């Protein structure tokens, strides 16, 4: 890495089962200048402004129950110890339960989150989903989480 700026671009483990597990040990994945990946979370090495982003890709076939799909980026402070949502989005993809004999057509739902935030040294960033059964990390570039000090 030629830059002096704290960075991260972590990606979903394609081999993980029933979970969204962040990985830096892949080609085109970053973790430099103090940023750490500890308990599936990005650890802020120093105070400043950070651009934080994440994408998830949801997949389903046909429709069952109403499906509520969430994607959130939250801040876990060193001082307050509390979890606050910084960036949040929802998708509820099933318009109608697939009729008894109708063919199940595969649906796809991407979600992108991103913004600039003032963070403190030691803060933890979490990019989470609620339904790993709907998560699609089968191919590269589909689900990622990153930060960059600005």
């Amino acid at each position, epitope marked *: 890495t030629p830059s002096d700026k704290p960075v991260a671009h972590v990606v979903a483990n394609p081999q993980a*089962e*029933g979970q969204l597990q962040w990985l830096n040990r892949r080609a085109n994945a970053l973790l430099a200048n103090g940023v750490e990946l500890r308990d599936n979370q990005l650890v802020v090495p120093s105070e400043g402004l950070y651009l934080i982003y994440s994408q998830v890709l949801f997949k389903g076939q046909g429709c069952p129950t109403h499906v509520l799909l969430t994607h959130t980026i939250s801040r876990i402070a060193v001082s307050y110890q509390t979890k606050v949502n910084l960036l949040s989005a929802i998708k509820s993809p099933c318009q109608r339960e697939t009729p008894e004999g109708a063919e*199940a057509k595969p649906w796809y739902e991407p979600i992108y989150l991103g913004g600039v935030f003032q963070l403190e040294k030691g803060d933890r960033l979490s990019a989470e989903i609620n339904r790993p059964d*709907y998560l699609d990390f089968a191919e590269s570039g589909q689900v990622y989480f990153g930060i960059i000090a600005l």
Partner: nanobody
Amino acid sequence: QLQESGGGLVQPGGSLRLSCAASGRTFSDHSGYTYTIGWFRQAPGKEREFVARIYWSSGNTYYADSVKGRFAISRDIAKNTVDLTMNNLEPEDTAVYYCAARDGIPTSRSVESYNYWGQGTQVTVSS
């Protein structure tokens, strides 16, 4: 709770369709988020190995490296069944094939992650 059908003898390079029916409680009636259904195989004197997985809710799948692209796992909501279509068969594909389920989302493809099992069905790949 689980019952496998299909199976038996098939010529190498051939195809076979296995089915897993949930008897008693339907796959639609889950306490958790979904039922997770897995297909496994046990070749004589070898450890039980993962073949494919599907979530009843989403229909999202995972395949073992040696079956990816030739085997297809699907779910039939109406018939409350989980099918496994096996193509490009080979003699070492001969094993007893088992259906396994979990009312929830496992964090592993390990045999230990599933508690409920079907009796199994023999698949023999030979001339």
